[PDB]
Amino acid sequence: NSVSVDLPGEMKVLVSKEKNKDGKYDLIATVDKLELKGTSDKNNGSGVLEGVKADKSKVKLTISDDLGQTTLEVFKEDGKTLVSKKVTSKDKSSTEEKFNEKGELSEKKITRADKSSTEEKFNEKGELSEKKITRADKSSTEEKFNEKGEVSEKIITRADGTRLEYTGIKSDGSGKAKEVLKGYVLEGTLTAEKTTLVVKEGTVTLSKNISKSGEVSVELNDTDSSAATKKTAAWNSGTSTLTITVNSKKTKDLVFTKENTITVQQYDSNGTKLEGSAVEITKLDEIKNALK
Prior knowledge:
Layout: E1 4-7, E2 11-15, E3 25-31, E4 34-40, E5 47-52, E6 58-63, E7 69-75, E8 82-89, E9 94-99, E10 105-111, E11 117-122, E12 128-134, E13 140-145, E14 151-157, E15 163-167, E16 175-181, E17 184-190, E18 194-201, E19 204-211, E20 216-222, E21 231-236, E22 241-246, E23 249-256, E24 262-266, E25 279-280, H1 284-290
Antiparallel strand pairs: 1-2, 2-3, 3-4, 5-6, 6-7, 7-8, 8-9, 9-10, 10-11, 11-12, 12-13, 13-14, 14-15, 15-16, 16-17, 17-18, 18-19, 19-20, 21-22, 22-23, 23-24, 24-25
Function: Induces host (human and mouse) cytokine release by monocyte cell lines via TLR2 and CD14; nonlipidated protein does not stimulate host cells.
InterPro entries: OM_lipoprot_Borrelia, OM_lipoprot_dom_sf
Pfam family, one: Lipoprotein_1
Protein backbone atom coordinates (compact mmCIF):
# COMPACT_ATOMS: atom_id res chain seq x y z
CA ASN A 1 0.00 0.00 0.00
CA SER A 2 0.98 3.63 -0.27
CA VAL A 3 2.91 6.64 0.95
CA SER A 4 2.41 9.76 -0.98
CA VAL A 5 5.69 11.42 -2.01
CA ASP A 6 5.40 14.97 -3.44
CA LEU A 7 7.85 15.82 -6.22
CA PRO A 8 9.49 18.62 -8.13
CA GLY A 9 7.13 19.58 -11.04
CA GLU A 10 4.01 19.65 -8.79
CA MET A 11 3.71 15.82 -9.06
CA LYS A 12 2.96 13.10 -6.50
CA VAL A 13 4.13 9.49 -6.72
CA LEU A 14 2.95 6.51 -4.62
CA VAL A 15 5.41 3.81 -3.47
CA SER A 16 4.77 0.35 -1.97
CA LYS A 17 5.40 0.41 1.85
CA GLU A 18 6.90 -3.15 1.65
CA LYS A 19 9.12 -4.72 -1.11
CA ASN A 20 7.10 -6.83 -3.97
CA LYS A 21 7.72 -10.55 -4.81
CA ASP A 22 10.77 -9.66 -7.04
CA GLY A 23 12.54 -7.79 -4.18
CA LYS A 24 11.86 -4.24 -5.50
CA TYR A 25 9.36 -1.50 -4.49
CA ASP A 26 6.57 -0.79 -7.01
CA LEU A 27 5.73 2.93 -7.59
CA ILE A 28 2.67 4.34 -9.41
CA ALA A 29 1.81 7.87 -10.46
CA THR A 30 -0.62 9.68 -12.74
CA VAL A 31 0.54 12.75 -14.67
CA ASP A 32 -1.70 14.60 -17.19
CA LYS A 33 -4.55 12.03 -16.93
CA LEU A 34 -2.08 9.17 -17.75
CA GLU A 35 -1.03 6.50 -15.21
CA LEU A 36 2.70 5.56 -14.98
CA LYS A 37 4.05 2.42 -13.26
CA GLY A 38 7.63 1.43 -12.44
CA THR A 39 9.76 -0.37 -9.79
CA SER A 40 12.86 0.79 -7.88
CA ASP A 41 15.78 -0.41 -5.80
CA LYS A 42 15.09 2.69 -3.56
CA ASN A 43 12.27 3.16 -0.95
CA ASN A 44 12.02 7.03 -1.03
CA GLY A 45 10.03 7.46 -4.27
CA SER A 46 12.94 7.95 -6.70
CA GLY A 47 13.25 5.82 -9.86
CA VAL A 48 11.59 5.67 -13.30
CA LEU A 49 7.91 5.29 -14.21
CA GLU A 50 6.55 4.47 -17.68
CA GLY A 51 3.24 4.44 -19.48
CA VAL A 52 1.78 4.55 -22.98
CA LYS A 53 -0.76 6.95 -24.50
CA ALA A 54 -3.60 5.93 -26.83
CA ASP A 55 -1.66 7.57 -29.72
CA LYS A 56 1.06 4.87 -28.98
CA SER A 57 3.41 7.44 -27.39
CA LYS A 58 5.72 6.40 -24.60
CA VAL A 59 6.07 8.55 -21.52
CA LYS A 60 8.87 8.24 -18.99
CA LEU A 61 9.13 9.97 -15.62
CA THR A 62 12.61 9.80 -14.09
CA ILE A 63 12.92 10.90 -10.48
CA SER A 64 16.53 11.49 -9.21
CA ASP A 65 17.84 9.55 -6.15
CA ASP A 66 17.85 12.75 -3.94
CA LEU A 67 14.29 13.78 -5.12
CA GLY A 68 15.78 17.12 -6.26
CA GLN A 69 14.74 16.72 -9.90
CA THR A 70 12.16 15.08 -12.16
CA THR A 71 12.43 14.39 -15.92
CA LEU A 72 9.30 13.78 -18.00
CA GLU A 73 10.07 12.57 -21.50
CA VAL A 74 7.44 11.87 -24.19
CA PHE A 75 8.76 9.69 -27.03
CA LYS A 76 7.29 8.53 -30.33
CA GLU A 77 6.20 4.87 -30.64
CA ASP A 78 9.83 3.73 -31.19
CA GLY A 79 10.51 4.98 -27.59
CA LYS A 80 13.75 6.73 -28.67
CA THR A 81 12.86 9.81 -30.72
CA LEU A 82 11.90 12.72 -28.39
CA VAL A 83 8.57 14.49 -28.74
CA SER A 84 9.01 16.67 -25.63
CA LYS A 85 11.02 16.87 -22.35
CA LYS A 86 10.58 18.79 -19.09
CA VAL A 87 13.30 18.79 -16.41
CA THR A 88 12.16 20.48 -13.17
CA SER A 89 14.11 21.21 -9.95
CA LYS A 90 13.04 21.35 -6.21
CA ASP A 91 13.53 25.17 -6.27
CA LYS A 92 10.98 25.05 -9.15
CA SER A 93 13.30 26.29 -11.91
CA SER A 94 12.75 24.15 -15.01
CA THR A 95 13.54 23.56 -18.69
CA GLU A 96 10.94 22.52 -21.31
CA GLU A 97 11.89 21.37 -24.82
CA LYS A 98 9.50 20.40 -27.64
CA PHE A 99 10.93 18.75 -30.77
CA ASN A 100 9.32 18.44 -34.22
CA GLU A 101 8.71 15.31 -36.42
CA LYS A 102 12.34 15.26 -37.73
CA GLY A 103 13.49 15.17 -34.02
CA GLU A 104 15.02 18.69 -34.00
CA LEU A 105 14.18 21.40 -31.43
CA SER A 106 11.27 23.72 -32.28
CA GLU A 107 10.50 25.37 -28.87
CA LYS A 108 12.46 25.87 -25.62
CA LYS A 109 11.04 27.33 -22.40
CA ILE A 110 13.17 28.25 -19.33
CA THR A 111 11.44 28.97 -16.02
CA ARG A 112 13.39 30.41 -13.03
CA ALA A 113 12.82 30.04 -9.29
CA ASP A 114 10.77 33.31 -9.19
CA LYS A 115 8.25 32.07 -11.83
CA SER A 116 9.82 34.44 -14.42
CA SER A 117 10.30 32.62 -17.73
CA THR A 118 11.81 32.95 -21.22
CA GLU A 119 10.34 31.01 -24.16
CA GLU A 120 11.94 30.65 -27.66
CA LYS A 121 10.48 29.14 -30.92
CA PHE A 122 12.58 28.04 -33.91
CA ASN A 123 11.56 27.88 -37.56
CA GLU A 124 12.15 25.11 -40.10
CA LYS A 125 15.89 25.88 -40.37
CA GLY A 126 16.67 26.33 -36.64
CA GLU A 127 16.47 30.17 -36.59
CA LEU A 128 14.64 32.03 -33.71
CA SER A 129 11.10 33.23 -34.72
CA GLU A 130 9.35 34.21 -31.44
CA LYS A 131 10.78 35.04 -28.00
CA LYS A 132 8.35 35.52 -25.10
CA ILE A 133 9.73 36.79 -21.83
CA THR A 134 7.27 36.62 -18.92
CA ARG A 135 8.01 38.42 -15.61
CA ALA A 136 7.25 37.44 -11.99
CA ASP A 137 4.43 40.09 -11.90
CA LYS A 138 2.87 37.97 -14.75
CA SER A 139 3.46 40.78 -17.29
CA SER A 140 5.17 39.91 -20.62
CA THR A 141 6.74 40.77 -23.94
CA GLU A 142 6.40 38.56 -26.98
CA GLU A 143 8.69 39.52 -29.94
CA LYS A 144 8.35 38.21 -33.54
CA PHE A 145 11.55 38.08 -35.65
CA ASN A 146 11.59 38.72 -39.41
CA GLU A 147 13.78 37.03 -42.05
CA LYS A 148 16.86 39.12 -40.99
CA GLY A 149 16.47 38.35 -37.24
CA GLU A 150 15.08 41.86 -36.43
CA VAL A 151 11.87 42.35 -34.32
CA SER A 152 8.88 43.06 -36.64
CA GLU A 153 6.00 42.44 -34.15
CA LYS A 154 5.95 43.16 -30.42
CA ILE A 155 3.15 42.39 -27.94
CA ILE A 156 3.34 43.76 -24.39
CA THR A 157 0.87 42.13 -21.95
CA ARG A 158 0.44 43.74 -18.55
CA ALA A 159 -0.45 42.03 -15.24
CA ASP A 160 -4.20 42.92 -15.70
CA GLY A 161 -4.25 41.38 -19.17
CA THR A 162 -4.36 44.50 -21.37
CA ARG A 163 -2.01 44.73 -24.31
CA LEU A 164 -0.01 47.14 -26.45
CA GLU A 165 0.37 45.47 -29.85
CA TYR A 166 2.82 46.84 -32.43
CA THR A 167 3.10 45.65 -36.06
CA GLY A 168 4.98 46.50 -39.28
CA ILE A 169 7.85 47.55 -36.97
CA LYS A 170 10.64 49.15 -39.01
CA SER A 171 14.35 50.15 -38.90
CA ASP A 172 13.43 53.78 -37.88
CA GLY A 173 11.48 52.46 -34.84
CA SER A 174 8.10 53.39 -36.37
CA GLY A 175 5.08 51.04 -36.42
CA LYS A 176 1.31 50.54 -36.31
CA ALA A 177 0.03 50.25 -32.73
CA LYS A 178 -3.11 48.92 -30.98
CA GLU A 179 -4.13 49.01 -27.33
CA VAL A 180 -6.41 46.15 -26.19
CA LEU A 181 -8.42 47.15 -23.10
CA LYS A 182 -11.30 45.45 -21.14
CA GLY A 183 -14.12 46.15 -23.66
CA TYR A 184 -12.45 48.20 -26.42
CA VAL A 185 -9.43 48.62 -28.75
CA LEU A 186 -7.59 51.96 -29.45
CA GLU A 187 -5.72 52.28 -32.80
CA GLY A 188 -2.67 54.55 -33.20
CA THR A 189 1.05 54.71 -34.19
CA LEU A 190 4.47 53.79 -32.78
CA THR A 191 7.59 56.01 -33.18
CA ALA A 192 11.10 56.30 -31.76
CA GLU A 193 10.07 58.49 -28.80
CA LYS A 194 6.47 57.33 -28.06
CA THR A 195 3.23 55.41 -28.71
CA THR A 196 0.24 57.60 -29.69
CA LEU A 197 -3.36 56.21 -29.69
CA VAL A 198 -5.94 58.50 -31.35
CA VAL A 199 -9.75 58.84 -30.82
CA LYS A 200 -11.69 61.33 -32.97
CA GLU A 201 -15.25 62.55 -32.48
CA GLY A 202 -16.39 65.15 -35.11
CA THR A 203 -13.88 68.05 -34.78
CA VAL A 204 -12.36 66.81 -31.45
CA THR A 205 -9.37 64.41 -31.38
CA LEU A 206 -8.03 63.00 -28.11
CA SER A 207 -4.51 61.50 -27.93
CA LYS A 208 -3.25 59.02 -25.32
CA ASN A 209 0.56 59.29 -25.49
CA ILE A 210 2.62 56.40 -23.98
CA SER A 211 6.43 56.89 -23.93
CA LYS A 212 9.17 54.19 -24.00
CA SER A 213 9.37 54.69 -20.19
CA GLY A 214 5.67 53.61 -19.92
CA GLU A 215 4.42 57.14 -19.13
CA VAL A 216 0.84 58.05 -20.15
CA SER A 217 0.08 61.69 -20.98
CA VAL A 218 -3.24 62.66 -22.68
CA GLU A 219 -4.06 65.78 -24.77
CA LEU A 220 -7.22 67.03 -26.55
CA ASN A 221 -7.58 69.30 -29.63
CA ASP A 222 -10.90 70.74 -30.86
CA THR A 223 -10.71 72.55 -34.20
CA ASP A 224 -14.11 74.35 -34.18
CA SER A 225 -14.25 78.06 -33.16
CA SER A 226 -17.11 78.93 -30.75
CA ALA A 227 -16.92 79.60 -27.00
CA ALA A 228 -20.36 77.89 -26.53
CA THR A 229 -19.10 74.58 -28.05
CA LYS A 230 -15.24 74.38 -28.49
CA LYS A 231 -13.76 71.82 -26.02
CA THR A 232 -10.36 72.47 -24.28
CA ALA A 233 -8.53 70.14 -21.88
CA ALA A 234 -5.87 70.34 -19.15
CA TRP A 235 -3.80 67.27 -18.12
CA ASN A 236 -2.71 66.53 -14.53
CA SER A 237 0.13 63.96 -14.68
CA GLY A 238 0.09 63.64 -10.85
CA THR A 239 -3.54 62.29 -10.83
CA SER A 240 -3.60 60.97 -14.48
CA THR A 241 -6.76 63.01 -15.21
CA LEU A 242 -7.88 65.03 -18.25
CA THR A 243 -10.28 67.81 -17.15
CA ILE A 244 -12.48 69.08 -19.98
CA THR A 245 -13.54 72.76 -20.17
CA VAL A 246 -16.22 74.23 -22.50
CA ASN A 247 -17.08 77.99 -22.45
CA SER A 248 -14.73 78.55 -19.49
CA LYS A 249 -16.50 75.88 -17.32
CA LYS A 250 -15.17 72.39 -16.27
CA THR A 251 -17.57 69.83 -17.90
CA LYS A 252 -16.00 66.47 -16.95
CA ASP A 253 -12.82 64.69 -15.74
CA LEU A 254 -11.45 61.69 -17.66
CA VAL A 255 -9.42 59.69 -15.17
CA PHE A 256 -7.02 57.11 -16.69
CA THR A 257 -6.51 54.47 -14.04
CA LYS A 258 -3.61 52.26 -12.82
CA GLU A 259 -5.90 49.31 -13.65
CA ASN A 260 -5.66 50.63 -17.34
CA THR A 261 -9.38 51.80 -17.60
CA ILE A 262 -10.95 55.28 -18.12
CA THR A 263 -13.67 56.88 -15.97
CA VAL A 264 -15.98 59.86 -16.33
CA GLN A 265 -17.81 62.16 -13.92
CA GLN A 266 -19.35 65.52 -14.61
CA TYR A 267 -19.13 68.84 -12.72
CA ASP A 268 -22.02 70.96 -11.30
CA SER A 269 -23.41 73.94 -13.37
CA ASN A 270 -20.52 76.23 -12.37
CA GLY A 271 -17.62 73.84 -13.31
CA THR A 272 -16.38 73.88 -9.68
CA LYS A 273 -17.32 70.63 -7.85
CA LEU A 274 -17.46 67.13 -9.36
CA GLU A 275 -20.89 65.41 -8.95
CA GLY A 276 -22.18 61.89 -8.25
CA SER A 277 -19.67 59.08 -8.92
CA ALA A 278 -17.28 58.17 -11.68
CA VAL A 279 -18.38 55.79 -14.42
CA GLU A 280 -16.06 53.22 -16.08
CA ILE A 281 -16.01 53.55 -19.97
CA THR A 282 -16.39 50.05 -21.54
CA LYS A 283 -16.99 50.87 -25.24
CA LEU A 284 -15.18 52.95 -27.85
CA ASP A 285 -18.55 54.77 -28.27
CA GLU A 286 -18.68 55.80 -24.65
CA ILE A 287 -15.32 57.73 -25.08
CA LYS A 288 -16.33 59.27 -28.44
CA ASN A 289 -19.67 60.35 -26.86
CA ALA A 290 -17.71 61.87 -23.88
CA LEU A 291 -15.89 64.03 -26.48
CA LYS A 292 -19.21 65.32 -27.87
